[PDB]
Amino acid sequence: TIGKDICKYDVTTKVATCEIIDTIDSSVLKEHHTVHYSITLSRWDKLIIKYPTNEKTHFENFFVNPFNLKDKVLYNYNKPINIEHILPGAITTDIYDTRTKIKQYILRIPPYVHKDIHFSLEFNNSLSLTKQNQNIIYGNVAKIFIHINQGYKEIHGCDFTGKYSHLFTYSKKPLPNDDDICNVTIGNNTFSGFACLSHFELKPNNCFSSVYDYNEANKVKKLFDLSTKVELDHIKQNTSGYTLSYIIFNKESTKLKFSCTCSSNYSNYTIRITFDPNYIIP
């Protein structure tokens, strides 16, 4: 008996959430030993999965496959692989609440998907048991099958690594003693972003969360001080060793100009974004 279920998609936030804890709990009788969730996503979507740790009561023998869930998925539903290798520019976070013993896995699909992919994740509580009313009840397994559609449009921004040429418009392998400034102009509903080596220093801190305001003598300002109609995301160091940041404007009226820098003892790389509400990209 393999059951089936769906992951709720919030249309407003573009967020899919899969609710598995009550499905695999060992304290309640269930008729499916394994439940299958199927979800299809596209570029920039987010997938949120709350899942237990085995400190949580009725999940004492729980485990995840792939075991390194933060970094990996099951390719073709069987073999572990770094999600970066099949979905370059992916961002995952894996947060643990020390008090509730619940964790939250979050996967951001990057702003452009170069190839159609499928992969899965398994949350296996089949070894956990609870004695409830003199019945020994076992936990269950939830498997999430994820399909991601091809990504529509390359990012209009700056790959300073030379390794994401398939993802960004500007892409150049970094050479010593470089003073490169990548100029970008974007209108609404258009992705920008950048990739650097993670050992480069990114200024200001966690760009674009703070940026140099070009229209105010390059003062460091939080992006929220310049706009509140913008979505962004960031990973400081993915499993390949790269930093990426992504940014997109939605119904922003004010013309904005800002920058960020990735610098080392050898080179400087600057991304300068001009956002123009009336700009129409060619």
Epitope: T53, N54, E55, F59, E60, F63, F67, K70, Y96, K101
Partner: nanobody
């Protein structure tokens, strides 16, 4: 967190036996795990044991051959390695954390000990 140090690595033949220990210097509220890294591979899950010893999990490939245990009073965990096969060669790490159900639970790591079959 917790300071971990392993010991007990050795060379043996297909069928030989070995016994690693791992010493902590708060151990008794952590799950412990053993991990194996062969050359050119990642640290692969071998075994885990809850803080109480009540919950134990083994990689499917070492079932029946290895036995994890622990001694909370003495802050020591053990891996008993029997029926050693040549694939078992590699570096063995002990690790500790609040949980062991996914790799991110393990916040403290030892330094590894070599096991050659």
């Amino acid at each position: 967190q917790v300071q971990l140090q392993e010991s007990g690595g050795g060379l043996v033949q297909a069928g030989g036996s070995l016994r690693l220990s791992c010493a902590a210097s708060t151990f008794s509220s952590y799950a412990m795990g053993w991990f194996h890294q062969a050359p050119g591979k990642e640290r692969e899950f071998v075994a885990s044991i809850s803080w109480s010893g009540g919950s134990i999990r083994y990689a499917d490939s070492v079932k029946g051959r290895f036995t994890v245990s622990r001694d909370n009073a003495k802050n020591t965990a053990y891996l008993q390695m029997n029926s050693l096969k040549p694939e078992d060669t590699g570096v063995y790490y002990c690790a500790a954390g609040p949980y062991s159900s996914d790799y991110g639970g393990f916040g403290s790591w030892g330094q590894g000990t070599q096991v050659t079959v």
